[PDB]
Design an enzyme around this catalytic site. Structure first.
Site, PDB file in Angstrom:
ATOM      1  N   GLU A 120       0.737  -0.964  -0.105  1.00  0.00           N
ATOM      2  CA  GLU A 120      -0.170   0.425   0.031  1.00  0.00           C
ATOM      3  C   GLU A 120       0.786   0.646   0.127  1.00  0.00           C
ATOM      4  O   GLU A 120       0.905   2.092  -0.679  1.00  0.00           O
ATOM      5  CB  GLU A 120      -0.610   0.283   0.955  1.00  0.00           C
ATOM      6  CG  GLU A 120      -2.195  -1.520   1.347  1.00  0.00           C
ATOM      7  CD  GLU A 120      -2.588  -1.103   0.044  1.00  0.00           C
ATOM      8  OE1 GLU A 120      -3.154   0.012  -0.742  1.00  0.00           O
ATOM      9  OE2 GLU A 120      -3.690  -2.203   0.295  1.00  0.00           O
ATOM     10  N   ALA A 121       1.432   1.057   0.663  1.00  0.00           N
ATOM     11  CA  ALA A 121       3.277   2.397   0.532  1.00  0.00           C
ATOM     12  C   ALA A 121       3.564   2.149  -0.734  1.00  0.00           C
ATOM     13  O   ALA A 121       3.940   3.531  -1.461  1.00  0.00           O
ATOM     14  CB  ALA A 121       4.166   1.485   1.372  1.00  0.00           C
TER      15      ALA A 121
END
Length: 262
Positions: A172-173
């Site tokens: 997600e980062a």
């Protein structure tokens, strides 16, 4: 497959930023950029050689796990710990075949009966993402837990939790500079905290945001996407423009339309 190395041990905003940029970099083919936002390679016709990247995670406990990330969605499809590989239940036969090309030198290969989606992972973990703290501490612990699963020292729920931490702090980062930023801030202040509604809604809406941008009319969404801010208040997205500093990678959803240049 390309390998990106990261250690939680003495991790800083810089070392983490370098890590996420490297992952994101390997995920960025340069072949598909839609409104300044890279699109991940289309799964169809994607050669097995161009399919995966490896994220080697080390921690303060001197333990190492190697996550395999899917080029098509930046998703963790499984991981290696020592002489064992563990893979999430494939969503299709193509993915099942694809993962046989990962960690082909391990003695032990296992496919989980469960998928690597949040819903399944949260149920297994006995906790929603909101109630699972993120930060370098959680990731440090996640790596140990992933490693000890190979030696039989990790319960499935803790696994799951650990997967949930790894996916958010890595997958997600890479997908979101915003989520990367949230993780950077956590590391900057040695903060261990569950993802706020802004992180959750971005994660939940990644596919829809990717589709909305790629199907947009010159960046304009046909229908708004409802997100939440950090404080949980409704934030409607009508356009790609406000997502440019937020979303770093999109899952391929449609072909870029023939350029309708003025």
């Amino acid at each position: 497959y390309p390998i990106i190395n990261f250690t939680t041990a003495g991790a800083t905003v810089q070392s983490y930023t370098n890590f996420i940029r490297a992952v994101r970099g390997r995920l960025t083919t340069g072949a598909d950029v839609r409104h300044e936002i890279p699109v991940l390679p289309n799964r169809v016709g994607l050669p097995i050689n161009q399919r995966f990247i490896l994220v080697e995670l080390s921690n303060h406990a001197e333990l190492s796990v190697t996550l395999a990330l899917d080029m098509t969605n930046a998703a963790v499809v499984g991981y290696r710990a020592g002489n064992s590989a563990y893979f999430f239940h494939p969503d299709n036969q193509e993915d099942a075949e694809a993962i046989t090309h990962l960690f082909t030198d391990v003695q032990n290969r296992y496919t989980f009966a469960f998928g690597g989606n949040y819903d399944r992972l949260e149920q297994l973990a006995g906790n929603l993402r909101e109630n699972i703290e993120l930060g370098n501490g959680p990731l440090e612990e996640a790596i140990s837990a992933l490693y000890y699963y190979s030696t039989g020292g990790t319960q499935l729920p803790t696994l799951a939790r650990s997967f949930i931490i790894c996916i958010q702090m890595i997958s997600e980062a890479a997908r979101f500079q915003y989520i990367e930023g949230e993780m950077r801030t956590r590391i900057r202040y040695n903060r261990r905290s569950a993802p706020d509604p802004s992180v959750i809604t971005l994660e939940n809406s990644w596919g829809r945001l990717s589709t909305a941008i790629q199907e947009s009319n010159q960046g304009a969404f046909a229908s708004p996407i409802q997100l939440q801010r950090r404080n949980g208040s409704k934030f409607s997205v009508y356009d790609v423009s406000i997502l440019i500093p937020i979303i770093a990678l999109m899952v391929y959803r449609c072909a870029p339309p023939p350029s309708s240049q003025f």
